[PDB]
CSV table of C-alpha atoms in Angstrom, one decimal:
chain,number,residue,atom,x,y,z
Q,1,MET,CA,0.2,-0.1,0.0
Q,2,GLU,CA,1.7,3.3,-0.9
Q,3,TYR,CA,1.0,6.1,1.5
Q,4,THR,CA,1.4,9.9,1.4
Q,5,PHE,CA,1.9,11.8,4.9
Q,6,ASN,CA,2.9,15.6,6.1
Q,7,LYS,CA,3.9,14.4,9.5
Q,8,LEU,CA,4.2,10.7,10.9
Q,9,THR,CA,2.4,9.8,14.2
Q,10,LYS,CA,3.0,7.1,16.0
Q,11,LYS,CA,-0.1,5.9,15.0
Q,12,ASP,CA,0.5,6.3,11.7
Q,13,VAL,CA,4.2,4.9,12.0
Q,14,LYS,CA,2.5,0.9,13.0
Q,15,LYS,CA,0.7,1.4,10.0
Q,16,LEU,CA,3.7,0.8,7.5
Q,17,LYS,CA,4.4,-3.1,7.1
Q,18,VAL,CA,7.7,-4.0,5.0
Q,19,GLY,CA,7.4,-3.1,1.3
Q,20,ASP,CA,4.8,-0.2,1.6
Q,21,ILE,CA,5.8,2.7,-0.2
Q,22,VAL,CA,6.1,6.3,1.3
Q,23,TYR,CA,5.9,9.8,-0.3
Q,24,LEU,CA,7.2,12.5,2.4
Q,25,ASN,CA,5.6,16.6,1.9
Q,26,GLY,CA,6.8,17.7,5.3
Q,27,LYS,CA,10.1,18.8,7.3
Q,28,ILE,CA,13.0,16.7,7.8
Q,29,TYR,CA,16.1,16.6,9.2
Q,30,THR,CA,19.4,15.3,8.2
Q,31,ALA,CA,21.8,13.9,10.6
Q,32,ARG,CA,25.2,12.0,9.6
Q,33,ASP,CA,27.4,10.1,12.5
Q,34,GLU,CA,29.2,13.6,13.8
Q,35,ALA,CA,25.4,15.0,14.4
Q,36,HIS,CA,24.4,12.0,16.0
Q,37,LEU,CA,26.9,12.1,18.6
Q,38,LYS,CA,26.8,15.8,19.1
Q,39,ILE,CA,22.9,15.6,19.2
Q,40,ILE,CA,23.3,12.8,21.9
Q,41,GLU,CA,25.7,14.8,24.1
Q,42,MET,CA,23.4,17.6,24.7
Q,43,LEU,CA,20.3,15.8,25.1
Q,44,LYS,CA,22.1,13.4,27.9
Q,45,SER,CA,23.3,16.6,29.2
Q,46,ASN,CA,20.1,18.9,29.6
Q,47,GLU,CA,21.2,21.5,26.9
Q,48,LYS,CA,18.1,22.7,24.8
Q,49,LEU,CA,18.5,21.9,21.0
Q,50,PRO,CA,17.3,24.7,18.7
Q,51,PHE,CA,15.0,22.1,17.2
Q,52,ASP,CA,12.2,19.2,18.4
Q,53,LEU,CA,12.8,15.7,17.1
Q,54,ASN,CA,9.6,14.4,19.3
Q,55,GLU,CA,7.8,12.1,16.4
Q,56,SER,CA,10.3,13.6,13.7
Q,57,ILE,CA,12.1,11.7,10.2
Q,58,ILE,CA,15.6,12.0,10.1
Q,59,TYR,CA,17.5,11.7,6.8
Q,60,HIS,CA,21.1,9.5,6.8
Q,61,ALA,CA,22.5,11.9,4.0
Q,62,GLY,CA,24.9,15.2,3.2
Q,63,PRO,CA,23.3,17.7,1.3
Q,64,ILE,CA,25.1,19.9,-1.1
Q,65,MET,CA,24.2,23.1,-0.9
Q,66,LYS,CA,24.9,26.6,-2.7
Q,67,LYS,CA,24.2,30.0,-1.5
Q,68,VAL,CA,22.3,31.8,-4.0
Q,69,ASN,CA,20.8,35.6,-3.5
Q,70,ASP,CA,21.0,35.3,0.6
Q,71,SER,CA,19.2,31.7,0.4
Q,72,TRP,CA,20.3,27.9,0.2
Q,73,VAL,CA,19.9,26.2,-2.6
Q,74,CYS,CA,20.1,22.5,-2.6
Q,75,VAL,CA,22.0,20.6,-5.6
Q,76,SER,CA,22.4,17.1,-4.5
Q,77,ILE,CA,21.2,15.4,-1.5
Q,78,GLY,CA,21.8,11.3,-1.9
Q,79,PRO,CA,21.4,8.7,1.1
Q,80,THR,CA,24.4,7.4,3.1
Q,81,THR,CA,25.1,4.1,4.0
Q,82,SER,CA,22.6,4.0,7.5
Q,83,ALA,CA,25.5,1.0,9.2
Q,84,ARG,CA,27.5,3.7,9.8
Q,85,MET,CA,25.4,4.8,12.9
Q,86,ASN,CA,25.0,1.4,13.6
Q,87,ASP,CA,26.6,1.8,17.5
Q,88,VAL,CA,24.7,5.1,18.0
Q,89,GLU,CA,21.3,4.5,17.0
Q,90,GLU,CA,19.7,2.7,19.7
Q,91,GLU,CA,20.9,5.4,22.1
Q,92,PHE,CA,19.5,8.5,19.7
Q,93,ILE,CA,15.8,6.9,19.2
Q,94,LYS,CA,15.9,6.3,23.0
Q,95,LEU,CA,16.9,10.2,23.7
Q,96,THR,CA,14.9,11.4,20.8
Q,97,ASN,CA,11.4,9.8,20.2
Q,98,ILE,CA,11.9,10.3,16.3
Q,99,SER,CA,9.4,8.3,14.5
Q,100,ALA,CA,11.1,7.5,11.2
Q,101,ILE,CA,15.0,7.3,9.8
Q,102,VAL,CA,15.4,7.6,6.2
Q,103,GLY,CA,18.9,6.3,4.3
Q,104,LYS,CA,20.3,3.6,2.5
Q,105,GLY,CA,21.5,-0.4,2.8
Q,106,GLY,CA,19.6,-0.8,6.1
Q,107,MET,CA,20.6,-1.1,9.3
Q,108,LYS,CA,22.2,-4.2,12.0
Q,109,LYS,CA,18.9,-6.8,12.7
Q,110,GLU,CA,19.0,-6.0,16.7
Q,111,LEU,CA,17.6,-2.5,16.2
Q,112,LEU,CA,14.9,-4.3,14.8
Q,113,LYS,CA,13.8,-5.0,18.7
Q,114,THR,CA,14.2,-1.0,19.6
Q,115,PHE,CA,12.1,-0.2,16.7
Q,116,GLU,CA,9.0,-2.7,18.1
Q,117,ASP,CA,9.5,-1.0,21.6
Q,118,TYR,CA,9.9,2.6,20.4
Q,119,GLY,CA,7.2,3.2,17.3
Q,120,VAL,CA,10.1,3.6,14.7
Q,121,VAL,CA,10.2,2.8,10.7
Q,122,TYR,CA,13.2,2.4,8.2
Q,123,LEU,CA,12.4,3.9,4.9
Q,124,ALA,CA,14.8,3.3,2.2
Q,125,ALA,CA,15.5,6.0,-0.2
Q,126,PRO,CA,16.5,5.5,-4.2
Q,127,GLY,CA,20.3,5.1,-3.9
Q,128,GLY,CA,22.5,6.6,-6.0
Q,129,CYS,CA,19.4,9.2,-6.5
Q,130,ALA,CA,21.0,13.0,-5.4
Q,131,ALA,CA,19.0,14.9,-8.3
Q,132,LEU,CA,15.3,13.8,-8.0
Q,133,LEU,CA,15.5,14.2,-3.6
Q,134,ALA,CA,17.4,17.1,-4.1
Q,135,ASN,CA,14.6,18.5,-6.9
Q,136,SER,CA,12.5,17.7,-3.9
Q,137,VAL,CA,13.5,20.1,-1.4
Q,138,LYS,CA,11.1,22.9,-1.9
Q,139,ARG,CA,13.0,25.2,0.9
Q,140,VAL,CA,15.9,24.8,3.2
Q,141,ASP,CA,14.5,26.3,6.7
Q,142,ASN,CA,17.7,26.2,8.9
Q,143,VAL,CA,20.9,24.7,9.5
Q,144,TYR,CA,22.6,23.8,13.0
Q,145,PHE,CA,25.9,23.5,13.8
Q,146,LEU,CA,27.6,24.8,10.9
Q,147,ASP,CA,30.7,26.3,12.5
Q,148,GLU,CA,31.1,23.5,14.1
Q,149,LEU,CA,30.8,20.0,12.0
Q,150,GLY,CA,30.5,22.2,8.4
Q,151,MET,CA,28.1,22.2,5.4
Q,152,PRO,CA,27.5,18.2,4.9
Q,153,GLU,CA,27.7,17.0,8.6
Q,154,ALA,CA,25.5,19.9,9.7
Q,155,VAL,CA,21.9,19.3,10.6
Q,156,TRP,CA,19.7,21.0,7.6
Q,157,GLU,CA,16.2,21.4,8.3
Q,158,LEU,CA,13.9,20.9,5.2
Q,159,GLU,CA,10.9,21.1,3.5
Q,160,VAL,CA,10.0,18.8,0.7
Q,161,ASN,CA,7.1,17.8,-1.5
Q,162,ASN,CA,6.8,13.9,-3.2
Q,163,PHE,CA,10.0,13.2,-1.5
Q,164,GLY,CA,9.8,9.5,-2.5
Q,165,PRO,CA,9.3,6.9,-3.7
Q,166,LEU,CA,10.7,5.5,-0.2
Q,167,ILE,CA,10.4,1.6,0.6
Q,168,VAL,CA,9.2,0.1,4.2
Q,169,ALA,CA,12.3,-1.8,4.7
Q,170,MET,CA,12.0,-2.3,8.4
Q,171,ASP,CA,8.8,-1.6,10.2
Q,172,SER,CA,8.0,-1.7,14.1
Q,173,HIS,CA,6.4,-5.4,14.0
Q,174,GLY,CA,9.8,-7.1,13.8
Q,175,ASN,CA,10.5,-7.4,10.1
Q,176,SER,CA,13.5,-6.6,7.7
Q,177,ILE,CA,13.5,-6.6,3.6
Q,178,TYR,CA,17.2,-7.1,3.9
Q,179,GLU,CA,16.9,-10.1,6.2
Q,180,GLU,CA,14.3,-11.5,4.2
Q,181,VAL,CA,16.1,-11.2,0.5
Q,182,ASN,CA,19.3,-12.4,2.2
Q,183,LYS,CA,17.8,-16.1,3.5
Q,184,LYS,CA,16.1,-16.5,0.0
Q,185,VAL,CA,19.2,-15.5,-2.0
Q,186,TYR,CA,21.3,-18.2,0.2
Q,187,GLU,CA,19.2,-20.8,-0.6
Q,188,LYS,CA,19.0,-20.1,-4.4
Q,189,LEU,CA,22.8,-19.7,-4.3
Q,190,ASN,CA,23.4,-23.6,-2.8
Q,191,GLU,CA,21.1,-25.1,-5.9
Q,192,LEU,CA,23.6,-23.4,-8.1
Q,193,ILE,CA,26.9,-23.8,-6.4
L,1,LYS,CA,44.2,23.6,-23.4
L,2,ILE,CA,44.0,19.6,-21.9
L,3,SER,CA,42.7,20.5,-18.5
L,4,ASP,CA,39.8,22.7,-19.4
L,5,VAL,CA,38.8,19.4,-21.9
L,6,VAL,CA,39.8,17.0,-18.5
L,7,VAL,CA,36.8,19.4,-16.8
L,8,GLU,CA,34.3,18.8,-19.5
L,9,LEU,CA,35.4,15.2,-19.8
L,10,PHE,CA,34.5,15.0,-15.5
L,11,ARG,CA,31.2,17.3,-16.2
L,12,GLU,CA,30.1,14.6,-18.8
L,13,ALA,CA,30.6,11.3,-16.7
L,14,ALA,CA,29.3,13.1,-13.7
L,15,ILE,CA,25.9,14.4,-15.1
L,16,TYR,CA,25.0,12.6,-18.1
L,17,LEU,CA,24.7,8.6,-17.9
L,18,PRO,CA,25.9,7.0,-21.2
L,19,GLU,CA,22.8,6.0,-23.5
L,20,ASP,CA,23.9,2.3,-23.4
L,21,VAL,CA,23.1,2.4,-19.7
L,22,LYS,CA,19.9,4.5,-19.8
L,23,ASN,CA,18.3,2.1,-22.4
L,24,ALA,CA,19.3,-0.9,-20.2
L,25,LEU,CA,17.5,0.4,-17.4
L,26,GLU,CA,14.4,1.5,-19.2
L,27,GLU,CA,14.3,-2.4,-20.8
L,28,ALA,CA,15.4,-3.8,-17.0
L,29,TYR,CA,12.0,-1.6,-16.2
L,30,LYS,CA,9.5,-3.1,-18.4
L,31,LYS,CA,11.0,-6.9,-17.9
L,32,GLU,CA,10.7,-7.0,-14.2
L,33,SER,CA,7.5,-8.2,-12.0
L,34,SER,CA,8.8,-7.0,-8.3
L,35,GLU,CA,6.3,-3.8,-8.1
L,36,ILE,CA,9.4,-2.6,-5.2
L,37,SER,CA,12.0,-2.9,-8.1
L,38,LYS,CA,9.9,-1.4,-10.9
L,39,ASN,CA,9.5,1.8,-8.9
L,40,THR,CA,13.1,2.3,-7.7
L,41,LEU,CA,13.8,1.9,-11.4
L,42,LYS,CA,11.5,4.6,-12.8
L,43,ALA,CA,13.0,6.8,-9.1
L,44,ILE,CA,16.6,6.1,-10.9
L,45,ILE,CA,15.2,7.0,-14.7
L,46,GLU,CA,13.5,10.3,-12.8
L,47,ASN,CA,17.1,10.9,-11.6
L,48,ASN,CA,18.9,10.7,-14.8
L,49,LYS,CA,16.7,13.2,-16.6
L,50,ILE,CA,16.6,15.9,-13.6
L,51,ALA,CA,20.5,15.9,-13.0
L,52,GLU,CA,20.5,16.6,-16.9
L,53,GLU,CA,18.2,19.4,-17.0
L,54,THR,CA,19.4,21.1,-13.8
L,55,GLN,CA,22.9,20.2,-14.7
L,56,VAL,CA,24.1,18.6,-11.3
L,57,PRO,CA,25.4,15.3,-10.8
L,58,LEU,CA,23.2,12.2,-11.3
L,59,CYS,CA,25.1,10.6,-7.9
L,60,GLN,CA,26.4,12.5,-5.1
L,61,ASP,CA,29.6,9.9,-5.0
L,62,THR,CA,31.3,11.0,-7.7
L,63,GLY,CA,34.1,8.7,-7.1
L,64,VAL,CA,37.9,8.5,-7.3
L,65,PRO,CA,39.3,10.0,-10.7
L,66,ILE,CA,40.5,7.4,-13.0
L,67,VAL,CA,41.8,8.3,-16.7
L,68,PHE,CA,42.5,6.1,-19.5
L,69,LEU,CA,45.1,7.5,-22.0
L,70,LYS,CA,45.4,6.3,-25.7
L,71,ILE,CA,49.1,7.9,-26.9
L,72,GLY,CA,49.0,8.0,-31.3
L,73,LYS,CA,52.1,7.9,-33.2
L,74,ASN,CA,54.9,10.8,-33.4
L,75,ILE,CA,54.4,12.2,-29.7
L,76,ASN,CA,57.6,13.4,-27.6
L,77,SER,CA,57.8,11.7,-24.3
L,78,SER,CA,58.1,15.3,-22.9
L,79,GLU,CA,54.8,16.1,-24.2
L,80,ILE,CA,53.5,13.3,-22.7
L,81,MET,CA,55.1,14.6,-19.5
L,82,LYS,CA,52.7,17.9,-20.1
L,83,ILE,CA,49.7,16.3,-20.8
L,84,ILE,CA,50.1,14.0,-17.3
L,85,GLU,CA,50.5,17.4,-15.8
L,86,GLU,CA,47.6,18.9,-17.2
L,87,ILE,CA,45.1,15.4,-16.3
L,88,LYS,CA,46.2,16.7,-12.6
L,89,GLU,CA,45.7,20.1,-13.0
L,90,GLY,CA,42.2,19.3,-14.7
L,91,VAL,CA,41.2,17.0,-12.2
L,92,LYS,CA,41.9,20.1,-9.1
L,93,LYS,CA,40.0,21.8,-11.6
L,94,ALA,CA,36.7,19.6,-12.3
L,95,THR,CA,36.6,19.2,-8.3
L,96,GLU,CA,36.0,22.7,-8.2
L,97,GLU,CA,33.8,24.1,-11.4
L,98,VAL,CA,31.5,20.8,-11.8
L,99,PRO,CA,31.8,20.0,-8.8
L,100,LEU,CA,33.4,17.0,-7.6
L,101,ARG,CA,33.2,16.1,-4.1
L,102,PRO,CA,36.9,15.9,-2.6
L,103,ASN,CA,37.4,12.1,-1.8
L,104,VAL,CA,40.7,11.2,-2.1
L,105,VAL,CA,42.3,10.6,1.2
L,106,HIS,CA,45.9,9.6,2.9
L,107,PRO,CA,44.9,5.9,3.6
L,108,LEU,CA,46.3,5.6,7.4
L,109,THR,CA,46.1,9.1,7.9
L,110,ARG,CA,42.6,9.9,6.3
L,111,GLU,CA,43.8,13.4,5.7
L,112,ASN,CA,41.5,14.7,2.6
L,113,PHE,CA,43.5,16.1,0.1
L,114,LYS,CA,40.9,18.3,-0.7
L,115,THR,CA,41.2,18.4,-5.0
L,116,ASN,CA,41.9,14.5,-5.3
L,117,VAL,CA,45.0,14.9,-6.2
L,118,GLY,CA,47.8,13.1,-4.4
L,119,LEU,CA,50.0,10.4,-4.0
L,120,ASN,CA,49.5,9.3,-7.1
L,121,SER,CA,45.6,10.0,-7.0
L,122,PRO,CA,44.5,10.5,-10.6
L,123,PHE,CA,45.0,6.9,-11.2
L,124,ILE,CA,46.4,7.4,-14.8
L,125,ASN,CA,46.2,4.3,-17.1
L,126,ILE,CA,48.6,4.4,-20.2
L,127,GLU,CA,48.2,2.7,-23.8
L,128,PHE,CA,50.0,3.1,-27.1
L,129,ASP,CA,47.9,3.3,-30.4
L,130,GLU,CA,49.8,2.8,-33.5
L,131,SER,CA,46.5,3.5,-35.6
L,132,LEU,CA,46.5,7.0,-33.9
L,133,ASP,CA,48.8,9.8,-35.6
L,134,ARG,CA,49.2,13.0,-32.9
L,135,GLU,CA,46.0,12.2,-31.3
L,136,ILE,CA,45.0,11.0,-27.7
L,137,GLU,CA,41.7,9.5,-26.5
L,138,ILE,CA,40.9,10.0,-22.8
L,139,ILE,CA,38.3,8.3,-20.8
L,140,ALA,CA,36.9,9.6,-17.5
L,141,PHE,CA,36.1,6.5,-15.2
L,142,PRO,CA,34.8,8.1,-11.8
L,143,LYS,CA,34.6,5.1,-9.4
L,144,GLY,CA,32.5,5.1,-6.6
L,145,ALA,CA,33.3,3.4,-3.0
L,146,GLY,CA,30.2,1.5,-2.5
L,147,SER,CA,30.9,-0.6,-5.7
L,148,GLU,CA,35.0,-1.0,-5.4
L,149,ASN,CA,34.3,-1.9,-1.4
L,150,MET,CA,32.9,-5.4,-3.5
L,151,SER,CA,35.8,-5.7,-5.6
L,152,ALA,CA,37.3,-9.7,-5.1
L,153,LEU,CA,40.5,-11.5,-6.3
L,154,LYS,CA,40.9,-15.4,-6.4
L,155,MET,CA,43.8,-17.4,-7.2
L,156,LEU,CA,41.9,-21.0,-8.2
L,157,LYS,CA,43.4,-24.2,-9.1
L,158,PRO,CA,43.8,-24.9,-12.6
L,159,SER,CA,42.0,-28.1,-12.1
L,160,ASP,CA,38.9,-26.1,-11.1
L,161,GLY,CA,38.2,-24.5,-14.5
L,162,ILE,CA,35.0,-22.7,-15.7
L,163,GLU,CA,32.9,-24.5,-13.0
L,164,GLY,CA,35.0,-22.8,-10.4
L,165,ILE,CA,35.2,-19.5,-12.0
L,166,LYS,CA,30.7,-19.3,-12.6
L,167,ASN,CA,30.8,-20.3,-8.7
L,168,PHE,CA,33.5,-17.5,-7.6
L,169,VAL,CA,31.5,-15.1,-9.3
L,170,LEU,CA,28.4,-15.6,-8.1
L,171,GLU,CA,29.5,-16.1,-4.2
L,172,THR,CA,31.1,-13.0,-5.0
L,173,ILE,CA,27.7,-10.8,-6.4
L,174,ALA,CA,25.4,-13.4,-3.8
L,175,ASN,CA,27.8,-11.7,-0.5
L,176,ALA,CA,27.2,-8.0,-1.8
L,177,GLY,CA,23.8,-7.9,-2.5
L,178,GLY,CA,22.2,-4.7,-2.2
L,179,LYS,CA,25.3,-3.0,-1.2
L,180,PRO,CA,27.1,-2.0,-4.5
L,181,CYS,CA,23.4,-0.3,-5.1
L,182,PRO,CA,21.8,-3.1,-8.0
L,183,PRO,CA,21.2,-3.2,-10.7
L,184,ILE,CA,24.6,-4.2,-11.7
L,185,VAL,CA,27.4,-4.3,-14.2
L,186,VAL,CA,30.0,-6.7,-13.9
L,187,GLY,CA,33.9,-6.7,-14.7
L,188,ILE,CA,35.7,-10.1,-14.4
L,189,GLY,CA,39.2,-10.3,-15.2
L,190,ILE,CA,40.6,-13.9,-15.7
L,191,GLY,CA,44.6,-14.7,-16.5
L,192,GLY,CA,47.6,-12.4,-16.0
L,193,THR,CA,49.1,-12.2,-12.6
L,194,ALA,CA,46.8,-11.0,-9.6
L,195,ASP,CA,47.2,-7.1,-10.5
L,196,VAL,CA,46.5,-7.7,-13.8
L,197,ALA,CA,43.4,-9.8,-13.5
L,198,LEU,CA,41.8,-6.8,-11.3
L,199,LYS,CA,43.0,-4.2,-13.9
L,200,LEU,CA,41.4,-6.4,-16.8
L,201,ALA,CA,38.0,-6.8,-14.2
L,202,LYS,CA,38.1,-2.9,-14.3
L,203,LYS,CA,39.0,-2.4,-18.4
L,204,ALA,CA,36.0,-4.9,-18.8
L,205,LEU,CA,33.8,-2.0,-17.2
L,206,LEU,CA,34.5,0.2,-19.6
L,207,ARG,CA,32.4,-1.4,-22.8
L,208,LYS,CA,29.0,-0.6,-23.8
L,209,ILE,CA,25.9,-2.5,-22.8
L,210,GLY,CA,24.8,-5.7,-25.1
L,211,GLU,CA,29.0,-5.4,-26.1
L,212,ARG,CA,30.0,-9.2,-26.4
L,213,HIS,CA,33.3,-10.6,-26.2
L,214,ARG,CA,34.5,-10.3,-29.8
L,215,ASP,CA,35.5,-14.3,-28.9
L,216,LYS,CA,32.3,-16.3,-29.7
L,217,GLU,CA,33.2,-18.9,-27.0
L,218,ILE,CA,33.7,-16.2,-24.2
L,219,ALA,CA,30.6,-14.1,-25.5
L,220,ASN,CA,28.5,-17.5,-24.6
L,221,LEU,CA,30.1,-17.7,-20.7
L,222,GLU,CA,29.0,-13.8,-20.6
L,223,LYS,CA,25.2,-14.7,-21.5
L,224,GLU,CA,25.3,-18.1,-18.7
L,225,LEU,CA,26.5,-15.9,-16.0
L,226,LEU,CA,24.0,-13.1,-17.0
L,227,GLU,CA,21.2,-15.9,-16.8
L,228,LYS,CA,22.5,-17.3,-13.4
L,229,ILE,CA,23.0,-13.9,-11.7
L,230,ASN,CA,19.7,-12.8,-12.6
L,231,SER,CA,18.3,-16.4,-11.2
L,232,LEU,CA,19.9,-14.9,-7.7
L,233,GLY,CA,16.3,-12.8,-6.4
L,234,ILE,CA,18.7,-9.5,-5.5
L,235,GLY,CA,16.5,-7.0,-7.7
L,236,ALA,CA,17.0,-3.3,-7.4
L,237,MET,CA,19.0,-2.0,-3.9
L,238,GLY,CA,19.0,-5.6,-2.7
L,239,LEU,CA,14.9,-5.8,-1.8
L,240,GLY,CA,14.2,-8.5,-4.0
L,241,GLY,CA,13.5,-8.8,-7.7
L,242,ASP,CA,14.0,-10.3,-11.0
L,243,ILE,CA,17.0,-7.9,-12.5
L,244,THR,CA,20.0,-8.2,-10.6
L,245,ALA,CA,22.5,-7.3,-13.6
L,246,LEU,CA,22.4,-5.4,-17.0
L,247,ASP,CA,25.3,-7.1,-18.3
L,248,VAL,CA,28.7,-9.3,-17.6
L,249,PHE,CA,32.0,-8.0,-19.4
L,250,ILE,CA,35.0,-10.9,-19.3
L,251,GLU,CA,38.8,-9.7,-20.6
L,252,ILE,CA,41.5,-12.3,-20.4
L,253,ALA,CA,45.3,-12.5,-20.6
L,254,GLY,CA,48.1,-15.1,-20.5
L,255,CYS,CA,48.8,-16.6,-17.4
L,256,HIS,CA,51.1,-19.1,-15.8
L,257,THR,CA,50.0,-22.8,-16.6
L,258,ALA,CA,50.2,-23.5,-12.7
L,259,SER,CA,47.8,-20.8,-12.1
L,260,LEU,CA,44.4,-19.2,-13.0
L,261,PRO,CA,43.7,-15.6,-11.4
L,262,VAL,CA,40.1,-13.9,-11.4
L,263,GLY,CA,39.5,-10.6,-10.5
L,264,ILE,CA,36.0,-8.8,-10.0
L,265,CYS,CA,35.2,-5.3,-10.2
L,266,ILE,CA,31.4,-4.4,-9.7
L,267,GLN,CA,29.9,-1.0,-10.8
L,268,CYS,CA,26.8,0.4,-9.7
L,269,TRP,CA,23.9,1.3,-11.7
L,270,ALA,CA,25.5,4.5,-12.0
L,271,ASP,CA,27.6,3.5,-15.0
L,272,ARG,CA,29.3,6.4,-15.6
L,273,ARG,CA,32.1,7.2,-18.2
L,274,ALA,CA,33.2,10.1,-21.1
L,275,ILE,CA,35.4,10.1,-24.3
L,276,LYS,CA,37.0,12.5,-25.5
L,277,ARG,CA,39.4,12.0,-28.6
L,278,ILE,CA,41.8,14.9,-29.1
L,279,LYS,CA,44.0,16.1,-32.1
L,280,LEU,CA,47.5,17.5,-31.1
L,281,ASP,CA,49.0,20.9,-32.2
L,282,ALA,CA,50.7,19.8,-35.7
């Protein structure tokens, strides 16, 4: 079933079985490893973020940006390999009560327990599709920690339209499409090797 | 003047996907049955239209800069040395004006060079061609990390033959799964030494989709391997599907009677290249 959301309530999160198609039309926040680490330091300590991640959508990515007429223009924002945040993403979900992670490749099986306990979904973005997703960015609202982390590692706050198609690849119901395909692939490979 | 041609060559490669690869992606889309992989493929085809319209790289990971240089008759070695400098300078300039991401680092320190030039970074492959006359051929081959990180070598026993080759190719594609972003293009190098086998596997990736080995017998092994690879069910992005690979390219060389080296170079759906022939001042 394909869905289109402007916001994702936990209610809607639990309504996304593996293999569903999603398009987003609202706010998204970018975060790579450096950003995930800084966010965890500051919420564990009681520092106020200038932004709210409660029930939010995180995109694993490094947006290329150009300053044009005293506003930012996106040129390319492809998805980052998500398994780079494998060792910080549990702590991250438990401090922030995010609703969705977007990226590519997937994340380790263990986190599927964390996605069932807290209400969270992982959505695969077309790997390689930097121009398509850039074109979906309607406006750049704000950027955080720019001076400290620099342009790709900074948290960019975006407004997107028809940001997709995204595939539900790990759900809040204990299912991972990566784990499924790898077991079938092992079986068909034995029948050849 | 070569540095500015080199810049236009990396812009070509970074933005405009070769037509043989776009066609193969349209065909992949009409041929598969998985709803997930059909959606993934139209997004990719849409990506490529938008990259060209808005003049931005089709893929954010513009890669490590690899350069294949063919050299014609009646060129001084001193002029070839100036051509190699202009190729470096044009990679420095391409990083700036394409733009390319600065991805070349020191392997132990991880210090970024900030121009993709350093420590033999512009990997420049040199060949001589007696059929060119004061004319060079430049291929720009921007290689991504995701696909290069699935490269494999294996020193088979000769008595393993063609069955052990097929088995090593299938094991390697299966192990990689969704990580070099399928659908994919497989380059297989057989023979030489270990370094030659991997050189061949990369060279095999310069070919156009549907371009079979000019030896009909190896052309047949290319199609057996494409059919068996498509049986794996990896599909677009390793999400499940009928099309795992767009094509299989083999290249061979003489090997030691007691050896059989086999190299594999995977390429992601973003097969990127651009070629230009250049007549030199008389």
